[PDB]
Structure formats: C-alpha cells, structure tokens
Symmetry: D2
Subunit: 264 residues, 4 copies
Amino acid sequence: TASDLLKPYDGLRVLVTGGASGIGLAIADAFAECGARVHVCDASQAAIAALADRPSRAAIGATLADVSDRAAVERVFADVAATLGGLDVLVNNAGIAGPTGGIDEIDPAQWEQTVAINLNAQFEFARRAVPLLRESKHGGAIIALSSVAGRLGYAYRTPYAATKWAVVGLVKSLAIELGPLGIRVNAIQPGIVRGPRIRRVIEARAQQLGIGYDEMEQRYLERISLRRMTEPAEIAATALFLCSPGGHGITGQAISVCGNVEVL
Amino acid sequence: TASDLLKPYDGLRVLVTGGASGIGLAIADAFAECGARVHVCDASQAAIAALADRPSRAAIGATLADVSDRAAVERVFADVAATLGGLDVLVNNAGIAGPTGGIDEIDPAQWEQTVAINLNAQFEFARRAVPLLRESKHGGAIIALSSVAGRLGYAYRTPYAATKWAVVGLVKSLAIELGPLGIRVNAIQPGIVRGPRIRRVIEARAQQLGIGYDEMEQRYLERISLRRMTEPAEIAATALFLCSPGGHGITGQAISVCGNVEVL
Amino acid sequence: SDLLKPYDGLRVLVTGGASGIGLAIADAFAECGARVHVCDASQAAIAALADRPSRAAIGATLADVSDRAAVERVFADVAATLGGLDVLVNNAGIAGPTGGIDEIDPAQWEQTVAINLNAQFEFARRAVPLLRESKHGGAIIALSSVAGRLGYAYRTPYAATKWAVVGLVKSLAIELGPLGIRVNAIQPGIVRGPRIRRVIEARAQQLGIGYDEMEQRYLERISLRRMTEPAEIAATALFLCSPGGHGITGQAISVCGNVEVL
Amino acid sequence: TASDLLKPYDGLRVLVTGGASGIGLAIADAFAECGARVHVCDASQAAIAALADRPSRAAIGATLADVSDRAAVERVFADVAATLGGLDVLVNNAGIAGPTGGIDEIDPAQWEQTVAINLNAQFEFARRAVPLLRESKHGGAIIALSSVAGRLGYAYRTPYAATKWAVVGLVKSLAIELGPLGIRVNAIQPGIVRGPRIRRVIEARAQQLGIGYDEMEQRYLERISLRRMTEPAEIAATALFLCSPGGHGITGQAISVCGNVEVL
C-alpha cells in the first residue's frame, strides 16, 4: 500500500545527536510525531531546557553532552538504556561549521576540534549503537549528517569539507560491514539550510571575501538550481523516509537534499 | 506535519512510460493510490489489457506505444492531453536490458536499440513534457529510471551501462537547466529488482559465464549489502517521496535503491 | 627514466585525428616512434597532414564515424599498413546543439549520440580482437569531457554522451582487463582552439550576452584560471601508454585546471 | 617535444612525508632521478640510515619525524628551509593502515591514531607548505596520497576509509582555494600495492574473516581488473607526471592507480 509504504515504522527507538536545535531537532520532532520514542543529546543547556512542555510537541528525552566528551557520550547511552531500552535508529547529526579561512590561516586547534566533532564522534556513537541496532526488529539504521560539502570542494572550509567527505566514506564502509546484520547506513547531505547557522556561515564567508552579507547570500542562492534554500523539514522528511518500509531497502547512499547546489 | 511531509501532492497528473508492467506499473499504481490521475504507455497490448478491472485498483489510462517509435510517442502525449489536460510528473521508466555479451560479440543492432530506448526515448519524452511541466502548479517533476549500472561498470552489458550513465548526465544537466523554472529532475537507480526481467538477466549472464543459474543468482545476492533483492514497491515509494512536500526540494540527484549493490 | 617514455613502436589509431585534440594526440604518438593512423571527416584536414616539415608521416582514412562502411574502411586501411593495433584513441566527437531540451533539433540530438557514443562502440568492437594481441597490453583511450562529470545546461545531448563514455570505459575496463586491455577516459576541460570558440559564441547567443562576458564566465570557473592546451591531453594519453602509466585502467582523468562547474 | 612534455621540471624542491620507505621512498627516489632536490621525513631512524650510499642513487635529505608531533614537523620544515631553501612540491604521503576490525571491535585509540596521521598531518604539512609553494617559480604542487579506499567503501577498515575519503575532500577544497595562486592540488589513489605493507593488511584481513592468507590474497587479486598488484613505481610515475609540463594543468583530481580495483 502506497500509504503505509511511506509511513515510518511505529514505535522506533531513536537517538539524535545534537538534537535539541536546528536540523537535529527537526529530525527528533518529526520522529516523535510518528510514534517514535526519541532521545537527543545536545551541548546547549538552554536548547535542552527549551524542549520541555512545548504545547504541540510529544515528550523527547535529553542528555547534556558534548559529543567529543567520552564520559558524556557514555552518559547518553546510559540515559537511552534506562528509558528507551534499546535502539532502532542512530541519527549521527551533531557537527560544527569549523573555522572559515585559508588553510594557512586557520587555527590548528579549530581544525582538530572540527575533526573530533564531525568525524570522530560519528565513530564514538556508531561503535556503541551497533550492538543495540543489530537487535532491532526492523533492521537497525544509522543516518549520518554529511553536507553538500561532502560531495564538492569548499575553499576556505577545508576541515569542514574533509570531515563531510569522511562521513560519506564511513557510511559506505559501514553499509558493507553492517549490511549482513540488517543495519542500513546512509548519509543525508543538506544543502544551504535556512536558519541561524547558515547566517553565521554567510556572515563569516562574507568577511573572508571582503564583501557584504547580502552579496554573499545572493552568491549562494544563484548556485542552487531551485534558487531556494533548503528547509530543515526536508531533512527530517528524508530521515523519516529512510525509516519507512518504502525506503528501508536503501543503504550505502549519500542523499543530497539541496535543491541541487551546483558548486560551493 | 510529518504525515503531510511524506504524502504526495493530491491530484498529480502523471505519465509513466513502460508503465503497464514491472517497475513502471508499481510506480503507476502507487501514484494512482495517492489521488493521481495516471496515464501509462506500454509496448505490450496484453499488459495494457490486464490493467482493467483489478479489484481495489483505480483506473489508469494507457497508450500502446514502443518508445523508440516517434509517431507512437506523439500519440501518447495526445492521449494524455485529451484525458489529463496537462502534466505534473513524467516518469521516464521505459527501458530494456539490451544484449549480454562481450563488446566484440553483441549485435550492433541491439546496441543501437538499447541506446534508442534507454537514452533517446528519454529525450523524446522530456522535450514534449517540459512545455507542460513548466505550467504545473507544483513546479513539475521528471523522474528518470537509471540503474546501479549507471554508477558502476558492467562487463558484458556495455550498451546498458552506457545508457544508464547517460541518464545520470541527462538528469544533472536538466536539473540545472530546468531548476529556475521549478521543474525537479532526478534519477532513481534500481538495484537487483525481484521480477521476471532480472531472472532473464541472470539466466543470460549465467550462459555468458558458463555457470548455472543458481550460482549466478548467488553471486548477485552476495554483492548486495542487505543480501536481498530490491522490491519494485521500493522504487515506487521513492518516486512518491520525490513528489511529496518533504522531497520537493531534491533535484539533480541519482538515488540508488538497491540494498547497496557493491559491485557488478 | 624508462617509466615515463611511451612504449616504442606502438600501432595507434586516432579517430577524428586530423585536427584539434585528435591531431595533437596523433602527432605526439608519432614523435615517440609510434606508427600512427587517423581517420577524419575533412579531406582538407587530411590533405594538410602531408609535407609538414617537422612531422613524421601519419596514415589517414577519410571517414565519417557515423558511417559504418567508412569505419570498416578505416580498419581495412590500418590492417593493410599497421598490421595490428596497440592503442585505440576514441577521440572523434561533436559538440552537438546548444539550446534548451525542448528547443533543440531532434536530428542534432541523434547526430550527437551517433558520433559521441555509438561510434565509440563501432571502433571498440573492431579494435578489441587486435588489442588483445598487443605485446604491451592493448589500450583504449576514450575522449570524454568535463561535461562527463558535471551537468551541462543547454548541452544535454553532449553531456549525456560524455557521461555515457565514462560508463562505457568503466564497463570495458572490467570486461577487457583480464585480457590485458587498459581502458580509460580523458576528460578535457575548456580547451583552447577554434572549437571552444564556437561553443562560447553559441552559448553567449543562448544567454543573450556578449562573447567576452561568456568567455570570462568560463575562465573564472577554472581553478587555475586558464584554458587547457591540447598538448596536455596529448601528454596524458602518452602517459597512459608508458610503463609508469600502464597500470591505470577503469578511470576518467579530468585534465581541466579543475573546471569547478558548468 | 613530446619528451619535454612528460619529464618533470628540473630542480624541483620536493618534500616527501614518510619518504624513507615504501611508496614514499619510490616517489622520493623517482624525483631524485629527475634532477630534483629531495627531502623526506620518516619516523624510523633505521629506514633513514639506509638511504645513504646506494649505488647510482642521488643523495636525499632526511628528518626524523613522527608526523603527529608538532615539534618534529617544525624541524622538518626547518631542515627543508636550511637546505632546499624553498619548496615546489609537497608530497603528503605519510599514512598508516589503522586497525582491522568491526567498528564495535576496534580500539578507539587506534581510530584516533589513524585520523591523526592520515588526515590531521595532511593539514599540518599543507598549512606550513602553502606559504612556500605560493612562491614556487613553477606554481607549486601538493600531491596527497589517498587510496582506492577513498573512492570505495571498506568494511572492517572504517577509520582508514574515512581518512582516505577525507583526503579527497581536502584536495578538492584546496584545489579551488589555491588554484588562483598557481598551486596544483591532486590525490593519487594507489590500489593494492606490492610490498610488505599490503602483506600485513592481507594477513590481518584473513584473520578477521577466518580464512588463510592465500585465499584472502586471491580475493584481492580477482577484484583487480588487470589481475595484478600495483607496483610502487607506478605511483611515483604518476607523481612525476603531475610535476611535468604535460601534467601541469591537472588539479582538483583524484587519480586512481590501481589496475581498476573493482570493489573492496
């Protein structure tokens, strides 16, 4: 049935990293709207506090954790085990923009921090989630958040691009490795996504190039085939589709949700 | 809402080429379940006659046409204009396997027919559909059927692989070209799809390699990360998702629905 | 050392080899001791091959590559003179039409596919029985384009065929590898010469802008900010036919200054 | 002049990281044969001592350095400055295989060490080389060593694959960033390269899968289209070509030198 082909499996146990704001919250709330038992971790106490008692919103569990903090990561899984009691979906969503600048300009600690959060934390969560996901009635799923910078080069954003390409290779390797266990592994590659984060990116890149914000933003928009920024709800919908009967045969793939970003 | 994000727009006017059997029929029937006004063309009179009066199946219009026959393609669009009155989605599904054999063994006329059906017909339908699609209230959509052989090499299937790669290049060019008009253009790449067509392919390749059917089938299954063939309904579900609000912002992409075919 | 010297005495056929990139490749091989033969659709270009002071003799057949009888004449000419084949350079190609997919002449779509795609098959199917007997392991060098790794608005038949070439190369590399035949695509970028100037002119008209503005848009989307020279394409083909490059197969090598987008 | 096209520029000042053994030494020796002023760093004192006084081998400079220690990297560039007096080519060759095992099995410390050496050290050397390379009379070049594991998924080798995909994204980003300065940036992707390193890899993977060395080796070989391993001199040849007039206009590319590894 076409109707239920597109309905995410009911009752999924979902963990979304960096899930109390932005795209991660859009994903977490979308799963929660579909009968999922959702837990998020997030680095922002204010973001976590803002989740509670939102009138139109099912409850979501939350752990304060910086994803590059191993003790904190273990607390996330302890909190998941104590409440969800299992795991069907890991959304490896947490990430930072990293520095903007020439490779000879950027601060080494900012490079390493971008790698630790955007890449090493993907491993830290995947290594702990795999023993849970292999027990999922639906075939376990890992959904990793790459970027259009994981399929294109991105001048003045080398640590960001490096990690987003790394996520693609990590997904394609895990898809082969975990496929026979039943665990699907895909990357979503968001484009230019409307919200506070991209405005910080545009502002920083405008400063890097010596041009105004309005001109920098226009350069981004004219390089989208649809001439329109991506909405976070499009990323959430794609994640839901991967966890529906119709999409649960997809694995090993990077799905760019971007209006066709033509070049960065 | 998450449920609305994943529902195809209501009332879509949809044309599915080669739509009376196999994957094309799964796509046509899926759209028809979601309130679409669906027309198909097909080369098989018997397949077309088998559409009518199936229990719980909404009516689907059909034109008898071989897509390599320009006169019959023109009649397809006349039948669509006289019934649907426009077009919102072109599903460029029609295709053939082509011959199995070394490049120095295969009949040149079979190379040529593979190109005429798998590549040239895509242009024939796209060029006639674009003037209609640019008037679609939703923007318009072209959904091309490539294959995993459009992202991998395929020994002994060179005309098939050449055309399925060509479809990706066509999609990526049209996405740029038509994006500002609002038309989304994507390829779906089916994997090893359960059906009579793949069984004929396996039998032909077994004969090419001098092995039995069951050994050939096992070689294909071992090279799917999920270790199972793709269902036609998965292809249909992906097409429906691209015509939903949540998938409306995807264009210029090839989406492989294949359980991760690792190699051909 | 020896690593970068192409194998001496190679028997090479270059399609569309009497002008442009194809002639660049053909002459480069002839400078390295190869016995080279070309086909070309222009008898004027063929007549210009002879009596070139600094240039070793190159054999030639007049042939439109979409004409099967003409293709068979090329191989008959090669067999009568070269007596074998070590390298097929599938170089012949046309730009095809410039325009929206709903605007272009279907006959020009078909012509682009016939020349850029079907002819690749027509030459490969006849070369393979020769190439598999090569002492060096036979080679097929196919000319794709940066339009074979990027989308190209208003150039859909061209892009479709250049992507097809990549898929054909990757399929043939698997198919023919165990026979020793290497198969690769070279993807030239924005290559200096008369043909790119016709393309820029045609695209400027499509976009209603002047030639100079159209040209500057192409140049600013090359990371090196300069057009590719034909000799670079020729050099890459030679490298694939050297000891150091002869373990490369299944690949598309973009020689383009990094065309960032089309 | 076809001979002038393929020979590297005379007098190139070349730094090869990890250059006293394996592929890196092959590259260093190849450049030294073509009139280059070559310097290497290496983590093994014993490997460095074996460079001296080899018959008809031009002398090569060396610095003892673990590419993950910042002070040793600073000494590398100090020795280069004191002897070469500049830099035309950085060869980012240093790397390790990392651990063999499922993602839930591998030591996190060895995940981290793989990322530190295969990715973070590329940044450490590139950021110090770029100020030198932008003064290169020939324009400057970075040659990064990726792997076929940077264009394919690699089960039970996830840190290695992730870092080798990262190198591709880093290369494509730097090619855009540094192109207008004249610096060419490419990745070479070696396949299954004959040497002691690949025999350790095969041994390790055979133990992971519970098969013998010969069977594991045979699986690798049957998935090379040319059915033979790549020689290190092929990698060196490709590096030399990128530093010739004929290869001078290639940038932003990953070149796989692998006999077509069909799958991992």
